């Protein structure tokens, strides 16, 4: 039924009051933004960082969902310089009541170069895969999250063997199993299987009617998958059904059972209750004796 | 609470873990082997350090088994991918050794490391501190001032940082050095999945001690109910077997 969900959080209630496509939380995310869009005035630096200012590049609408796996920590960040403005943003978010947890990391605002760590390889990064706003929450999320040594393989065999490589400047590897779960690979050697969340916290360029609508036939695609699944054990349902058929019919043999013991118990009745009735006519054998 | 077989039946997922455990145990020359997940075998010394341990390892090595030389994982690891989709961790020989020994960790407000809050075997409590590297990280019950983590922030002037995860009380900051630019550093607060930051309180007592137990009580109060009208029926039953036995 989440997948289910999964094919309504596209077109219920979208870019108004989706609570799971784009409001992560109560409805206080528009409270929160209006609240520091108006309250700007006493904060030293404006705090408008990350998930909103981050938006997936064209042609890998399929990494979304391991680029939120991976960088979820980020996702749900702010941009807050000062200490002071540090808890001025904290008694501002218990005052206009969010009940999720956002994850707050001090930083200052600065551009600089990182294309000497940036991965070496013919196939594309996150940072190729991102498109952001501003240059300092890029180089926010490089300092963080390390989105330059991070690659994009879709085989699994391809992306194992390519860090089992020893690569410069790579640290982790991306891979795509399915539309529900992902490979995220570290060293070549360890393997880790990590679920992709529900709830998106990823902007797409791409509208909701054209360019989305194939991305949600591919959803369509996975409730076949669960179909499978769910036909797969109709195999082993049959089983269980021909058990149970197995186990009335013995219910069956054990009342027919039950029929032949009371009649066994009627004809010793019936054998039993003339015994000593009227039989003892010994008036002719007395004359014989 | 139990880190034995009974733990394996709270999440569908661990019946493959469930499984390969089973199998393990049944084959002699495997347990001696492949030990038990540290889910299992490794245990913290309270509540307060159990939930430490489980933030630093994550559920997929928490749930893997231990390869203790590399002899058995070329040709006895094939029949446990196979059938069991579980994550499989081989020991290597990488040195165990803290940079820092624990005399200057206690002097920053730490009590210990992670690697002594918590018991178990010797084999898969040494691949712990190789995959999480729990035995780089103090550990302290205690929360430190704010002060004494821009202190820890600081790194040192050879430039390398002293420790690149802290744990004070209950709050777990990441320590993460920029490697480029001024070599700028930045911390990374989580809060460990838990309660909340209480020493010794009321502990959140809004209408009950816990918020499942009483859901847990209140199906043994159902259970309970049930077995008195199985009690009572079984007592009507034999009370007709009474009024059969005067008509016999």
Known sequence: SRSIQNKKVELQNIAKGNDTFLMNFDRNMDRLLRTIEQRKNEFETPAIGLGSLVTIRKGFEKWTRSIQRAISSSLNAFVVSNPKDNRLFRDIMRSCGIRSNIPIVTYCLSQFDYSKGRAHGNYPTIVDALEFSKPEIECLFVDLSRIERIVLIEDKNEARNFLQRNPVNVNMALSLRDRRSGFQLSGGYRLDTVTYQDKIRLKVNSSSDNGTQYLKDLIEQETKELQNIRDRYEEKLSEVRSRLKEIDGRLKSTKNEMRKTNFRMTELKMNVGKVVDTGILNSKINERK | TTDKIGILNQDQDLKEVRDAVLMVREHPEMKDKILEPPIMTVSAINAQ????????????????????????????????????????????????????????????????????????????????????????????????????????????????????????????????????????????????????????????????????????????????????????????????????????
């Open chain 2, 49 to 248: 350090f159990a939930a430490y341990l489980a933030q630093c390892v994550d559920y997929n090595t928490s749930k893997a088994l231990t390869v203790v030389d590399s002899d058995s994982y070329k040709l006895f690891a094939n029949p446990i991918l196979d059938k069991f989709k579980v994550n499989l961790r081989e020991l290597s020989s990488a040195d165990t050794t803290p940079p820092v020994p624990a005399e200057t960790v206690r002097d920053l407000g730490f009590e210990g490391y992670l690697s002594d809050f918590i018991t178990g075997d010797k084999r898969v409590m040494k691949m712990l501190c190789q995959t999480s590297k729990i035995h780089t990280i103090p550990v302290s019950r205690r929360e430190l001032t704010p002060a004494q983590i821009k202190k820890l922030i600081t790194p040192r002037p050879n430039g390398k940082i002293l420790f690149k995860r802290i744990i004070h009380g209950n709050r777990l900051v990441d320590i993460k050095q920029s490697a480029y630019g001024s070599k700028q550093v930045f911390p990374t607060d989580v809060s460990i999945k838990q309660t909340n930051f209480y020493q010794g309180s009321i502990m959140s007592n809004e209408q009950k001690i816990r918020i499942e137990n009483e859901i847990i009580n209140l199906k043994n109060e159902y259970n309970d109910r049930k077995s008195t009208l199985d009690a009572l029926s079984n007592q009507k039953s034999g009370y007709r077997h009474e009024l059969s036995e005067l008509a016999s």
